[PDB]
């Protein structure tokens, strides 16, 4: 399966759902390197494993 979200320019984090709507908060792998830059940017998730995208 796979999941689309967008990131917080105060938080990091894909703001996506699993399950069947379950609300799900996980930071994306982007220490002082893009942590965001724009309210919901842009996001993406994949179950192949959890690899979380970023803008």
């Given at each position: 399966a796979k999941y689309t979200g967008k990131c917080t320019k105060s938080k990091?984090?894909?703001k996506?759902?699993?399950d069947a709507?379950?609300?799900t908060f996980i930071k994306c792998p982007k220490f002082d390197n893009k942590k965001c830059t724009k309210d919901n940017n842009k996001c993406t998730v994949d179950t192949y494993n959890n690899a979380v995208d970023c803008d």
């Open positions: 990091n984090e894909c996506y759902k699993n709507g379950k609300d």
